[PDB]
Amino acid sequence: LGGYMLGSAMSRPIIHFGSDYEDRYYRENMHRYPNQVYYRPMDEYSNQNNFVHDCVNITIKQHTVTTTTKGENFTETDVKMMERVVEQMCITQYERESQAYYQR
């Protein structure tokens, strides 16, 4: 990373895949999943969804490196479920900082 950073943790977003199976599938292991999200300052630009689609990429990439380095690797469904959890959290982490620009 070397620029991009980590702010706050959250609650685990209860995702909806539409299958209660896949809810509880994540939910059985959810403590092992991510609980904070990697973002960067606006500085120049911002979007509504596309910088979130950037931030999600970084958080999964990091976990696919620095925790995969700890032996703890993931499958693609594990990634896709993370992408959801991380996007959900990134929406709030974006909005929290974005509201502070508005408050200026």
Side-chain angles (χ1 to χ4, degrees), residues 16 28 80 86:
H16 312 326
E28 278 176 325
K80 265 135 60 86
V86 170

Side-chain angles (χ1 to χ4, degrees), residues 7-103:
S8 176
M10 306 193 194
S11 30
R12 288 94 204 142
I14 304 314
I15 306 305
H16 312 326
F17 298 93
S19 285
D20 197 72
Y21 162 64
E22 284 225 301
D23 151 81
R24 192 217 195 161
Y25 181 94
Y26 151 64
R27 226 159 35 88
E28 278 176 325
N29 106 121
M30 70 200 310
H31 314 108
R32 302 205 287 234
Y33 260 48
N35 84 301
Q36 334 187 216
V37 287
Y38 273 76
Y39 80 104
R40 52 178 160 135
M42 312 304 233
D43 225 285
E44 198 274 270
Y45 95 129
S46 41
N47 302 146
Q48 187 164 44
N49 210 148
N50 252 104
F51 155 115
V52 159
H53 179 257
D54 198 101
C55 85
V56 169
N57 202 272
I58 274 56
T59 304
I60 280 65
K61 189 179 178 74
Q62 259 272 289
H63 225 59
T64 307
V65 182
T66 303
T67 296
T68 295
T69 293
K70 305 183 154 191
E72 183 170 12
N73 146 105
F74 308 91
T75 70
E76 199 133 72
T77 310
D78 294 82
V79 173
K80 265 135 60 86
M81 288 185 153
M82 266 115 75
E83 292 182 336
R84 269 301 195 178
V85 154
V86 170
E87 193 191 32
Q88 283 304 325
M89 283 194 260
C90 202
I91 289 161
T92 303
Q93 196 101 195
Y94 155 69
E95 276 293 291
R96 271 183 146 188
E97 188 72 358
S98 196
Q99 281 289 308
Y101 192 114
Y102 255 103
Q103 276 212 250

